[PDB]
Design a protein around this ligand. Structure first.
Ligand SMILES: NC(=O)c1ccc[n+]([C@@H]2O[C@H](COP(=O)([O-])OP(=O)(O)OC[C@H]3O[C@@H](n4cnc5c(N)ncnc54)[C@H](O)[C@@H]3O)[C@@H](O)[C@H]2O)c1
Ligand SMILES: NC(=O)c1ccc[n+]([C@@H]2O[C@H](COP(=O)([O-])OP(=O)(O)OC[C@H]3O[C@@H](n4cnc5c(N)ncnc54)[C@H](O)[C@@H]3O)[C@@H](O)[C@H]2O)c1
Ligand SMILES: NC(=O)c1ccc[n+]([C@@H]2O[C@H](COP(=O)([O-])OP(=O)(O)OC[C@H]3O[C@@H](n4cnc5c(N)ncnc54)[C@H](O)[C@@H]3O)[C@@H](O)[C@H]2O)c1
Ligand SMILES: NC(=O)c1ccc[n+]([C@@H]2O[C@H](COP(=O)([O-])OP(=O)(O)OC[C@H]3O[C@@H](n4cnc5c(N)ncnc54)[C@H](O)[C@@H]3O)[C@@H](O)[C@H]2O)c1
Ligand SMILES: O=[N+]([O-])c1ccc(Oc2ccc(Cl)cc2O)c(Cl)c1
Ligand SMILES: O=[N+]([O-])c1ccc(Oc2ccc(Cl)cc2O)c(Cl)c1
Ligand SMILES: O=[N+]([O-])c1ccc(Oc2ccc(Cl)cc2O)c(Cl)c1
Ligand SMILES: O=[N+]([O-])c1ccc(Oc2ccc(Cl)cc2O)c(Cl)c1
Lengths: 292, 292, 292, 292
């Protein structure tokens, strides 16, 4: 009878969905937090059965989406939403979509929960290389993908039982440089990986709650493609060609690792970057003239 | 029908036993590899009912020990056994206890296995500190504690299914210095951790097998008490006071992590050091100032 | 005949000054970038000879401060300065103090330069632990101490010869948690250490310019004290008691390491975190019951 | 009046020679430690004028070689020398070439020294890959390439002044996997790097001596060509194409870094791996996509 809130699904091709899927296997109940620029479209599609293929696990196995909620990790409380957004065509009529508000909403409909998933990032100047990134873009990049965590945490902590567990998805570009992962994104993942440690410290001592981050390998998500055959087709090709594990990398591969961190089985792991990436990170050089 | 071989275990108060309990939850067959010198005394205790309590997994299921074999990580093959130990009282009443010998044995009787555990260390001069450690002592430590993993992998690979998984147990003394943990042990784990990556690539690319290592926090095992109010009673004292996670670290804590890494659920993780240490590894200074 | 611009001196008790000092030894000419809330006071004191003690190197050795400039790393170009600051009592009448403007000023008075020093940080909610840090505070923390680098870089790159070198000062709290280094500061140093890599990449390939960061140990600076005998007296005590090198840690110790990175001698080092900290970072545990 | 002993050098095309040139710039006396087997052929070349060109530091100063001694990193003391090598043609015409023997020698003739360099490696089975590497081979690699540093430190510490400095040369194959670099070499450097920390603490606390290691990028030395268009011609090719720093890495590049770490100028750096590799270590994937 565990409940998990997933911040950041827009379709079935992301890591969000992968996570959601494997969490169903373990019979855990799933709440989607959905960015308002996509909420209505995700909703409609779902009613249309556009996802019925993708909700299939195996033997009789569907999914169990408890609830689907509008949610914007930019806004901490309702006093944050600026007037222009408060009025936006997309945001206009949706309510309780800040971080503080969803916590309450969830706690009202379902009480305390014990699993929190951060699978989101956003950065305006991503296509600009770091050196040519504006201040206003960089701080945006960090607001939307680093802080959204810290803040998710402050607020969700009170609707969580002790022994609850939290995860987030990071990228190796934080540790080693991969060019064209810019406009703040590499800084943001770097900070997110440090905050994972510090938060683990406070949440551990104070609430008996754990937090970790998964350094994911390359997956063909909506957002991955949005990064301008692109950077992510190369990323995949390279990985499928050079990683120690040569199999294709599925979102469920991260999904099953996520479920594990989230469950009691990993109670002795906290503050860690766990790479789930067919082991690419362990490589230094292409092994070209070594494969002869 | 999964079989796991565990190399290194002389009692129930160690990590290997933590690992075996937790795998038995997943109905995994366990073969034990026991250091010849304690092999007979372990057999006797087993036979005398000393482990029946420790063998209970829960309400009407116990531990499924498929077999228990003498195994010595010092000797790769038959040729490697030296006169003094052919002589040696504890060794003479036993046979086929070299790495290549237990590999053929297991395989002769039960076929291919698919989970392998290296949970052993020896450092004749642990008592001394690195600077006062001798060449003979140091290398004995590297031989038994680091190379034994490579030799295990080489001889056991043939008898394992593709998509199999191997683990080792390491310690933070390799990354950050821990005074008292001497005689080569740090160097040994330092090498175990890197070999984990290198092997992760060879196994990864050639046999589609995965290999990871578990950085465990402190446990009051017999090996740990033999370092010596013992450089383990401090370790435990400090950890329970300072680690993000106030809980007391149990062997099964590592076992559950082992079980997972050894399963299909983690098919995309290879070559990693996975810290299962209540998060102690993330801390810099004691937090005495902060706690006020 | 090398010139260096030091962003971030307010007195003689910081790392800025340490760096400035050792750079004089190697006869390099020094330009101070000084935060306007302190500019006038630093100026007056200097004219008064309040620093004449502290400008002494050794035999006949004074310093050679080329020029002392107002400078605020918050503002990239003059179009950034908001009206309230444009009007502030402290900022009112000072000109050309944004990042873009000082670059020009310097290039006009002295042409191209070849050494850039980032020794600054600022964070509003430093006294708040991370979990209880506002978004607006965090993004501030990162703006002032992470981005100020990236932006210093964009702009200063064009007033720099190829083979010029750049450094910044970081703290170990980015890698391992030290509580009460909050309100964004640990995230900010974490990002700064990642940006050091990425910038090294671009500046290396494009301009033949190097960038590194120095993970400094604890020094009793103005700002260190401002962090609420405080956290930094403990930090020092602990370090002087537990670091492998038991000597007291001087700003000139970082200063001499800085000068080296900045000089040609280190032409093969870039993108690195170099710890200058009497080796504290290498420790895992206090060695209390080991010193018996 | 500073004396530096360099352990491991058979010609001018290596790193040790890079180190000696650059220290001679600082008027540091150089004692060479040469592997007995090449000691005589090196002596002859020296005598025959083959190094006169390489010995020029600049306009009217050459290299000050105080002495040149046979030195074998395999043997700590007299007792350690085995019959076959007492016999051995190359070895028999020589004496006092064990670690403890060259320590007493140097000290007998010239007193206390204050800079020590370990610039040597051997891996009998480098050609094989870790999985196919034998126990005898692996340990020989750890013995000659890793433990020889500890033994050097122990026997040389007495004959060194407080505030002295020791360096070792390492390689990234220990952190991230490099296929081809086999037979134990990775494990060896993996251990050299951790020992550097542990020794950094013992030396640090007890004798006020410092110890660091230099992670060098590739150089076409005789040792490197003997790995084998050679797993060094790739290394160099790749590095000059991909490393942030387009320059061609010279031995003196490392030498200047060595000189510095070995000086007082770095009194606050101990226990560190310092990458002197044109920054190649910071990169993740080749940047082919980006460069377009
Ligand atoms: N796919 C990869 O190659 C890859 C690799 C490593 C890490 N990641 C990480 O995985 C996570 C998910 O990305 P993905 O690759 O699955 O693509 P994705 O497009 O599925 O994920 C982005 C999701 O976050 C949501 N989102 C964006 N901005 C938001 C905001 N302000 N508030 C609330 N929600 C918002 C979007 O609706 C979208 O569904 C990110 O943390 C990303 O950095 C992805
Ligand atoms: N206990 C801890 O606090 C702790 C912490 C971190 C890592 N570890 C690691 O966990 C692993 C398991 O050890 P443990 O601490 O549970 O102690 P343990 O006594 O349970 O296991 C050590 C075993 O090594 C075996 N052994 C020693 N030399 C051998 C040889 N030459 N051939 C064959 N077997 C040999 C013995 O069977 C012994 O039981 C070790 O690698 C240890 O380094 C332990
Ligand atoms: N002292 C330590 O214990 C320690 C340890 C590790 C790292 N550091 C780092 O060293 C650097 C210098 O700090 P310090 O400890 O020498 O103290 P400091 O007070 O000397 O340094 C701060 C300086 O930066 C200037 N500054 C602040 N905000 C600015 C802004 N917006 N624009 C321009 N200048 C600004 C201030 O005038 C001040 O002189 C920082 O990067 C800090 O994170 C300090
Ligand atoms: N060349 C590179 O690309 C490179 C890169 C990274 C690290 N390194 C490291 O730099 C160091 C110097 O080696 P190099 O690459 O300049 O090659 P090198 O041939 O100059 O030095 C290796 C030396 O090791 C000595 N040696 C070998 N076995 C010995 C023994 N048993 N006793 C005494 N001496 C012995 C020989 O004198 C030999 O000259 C090595 O540790 C190497 O691993 C080299
Ligand atoms: O908004 N962005 O710029 C952006 C950038 C990157 C994003 O995720 C990744 C997509 C692909 C990869 Cl390889 C790593 C990632 O972190 C996401 Cl979800 C969003
Ligand atoms: O041979 N030893 O000395 C030795 C030393 C330590 C051993 O295990 C550990 C026990 C305690 C800790 Cl903290 C770390 C360990 O690696 C083991 Cl199994 C064996
Ligand atoms: O503005 N702050 O909050 C702030 C916080 C920390 C600052 O520097 C440090 C001072 C002391 C230490 Cl230990 C590490 C540091 O990074 C500085 Cl200069 C400024
Ligand atoms: O004994 N070996 O095989 C061996 C192998 C490599 C050696 O040096 C290196 C040469 C090249 C590189 Cl890339 C790294 C190195 O460590 C040395 Cl000095 C010796």
């Amino acid at each position: 009878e565990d409940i998990c809130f997933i911040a950041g699904i827009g379709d079935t091709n992301g890591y969000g969905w992968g996570i959601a899927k494997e969490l169903s296997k373990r019979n855990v109940k799933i709440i989607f937090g959905i960015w308002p620029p996509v909420y209505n479209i995700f909703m409609k599609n779902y009613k249309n059965g556009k996802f019925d293929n993708d909700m299939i696990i195996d033997k009789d196995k569907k999914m169990n989406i408890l609830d689907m909620l509008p949610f914007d990790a930019s806004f901490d409380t309702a006093n944050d939403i600026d007037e222009e957004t408060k009025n936006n065509k997309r945001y206009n009529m949706l309510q309780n979509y800040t971080i503080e508000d969803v916590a309450n909403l969830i706690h009202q409909k379902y009480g305390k929960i014990n699993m929190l998933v951060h699978s989101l990032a956003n950065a305006k100047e991503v296509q600009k290389d770091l050196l040519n990134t504006s201040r206003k873009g960089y701080l945006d990049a960090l607001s939307k993908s680093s802080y959204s965590l810290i803040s998710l945490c402050k607020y969700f902590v009170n609707i969580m039982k002790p022994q609850s567990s939290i995860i987030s998805l990071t990228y190796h570009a934080s540790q080693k440089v991969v060019p064209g992962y810019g406009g703040g994104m590499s800084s943001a993942k770097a900070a997110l990986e440090s905050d994972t440690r510090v938060l683990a410290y406070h949440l551990g001592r104070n609430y008996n709650i754990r937090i970790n981050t998964i350094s994911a390998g390359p997956l063909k998500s909506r957002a991955a493609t949005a990064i301008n055959y692109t950077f992510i087709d190369y990323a995949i090709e390279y990985s499928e060609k050079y990683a120690p594990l040569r199999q294709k990398l599925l979102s469920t591969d991260i999904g099953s690792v996520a479920s594990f961190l989230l469950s009691r089985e990993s109670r002795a792991i906290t503050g860690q970057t766990i790479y789930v990436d067919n082991g690419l990170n362990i490589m230094f050089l292409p092994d070209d003239i070594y494969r002869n």
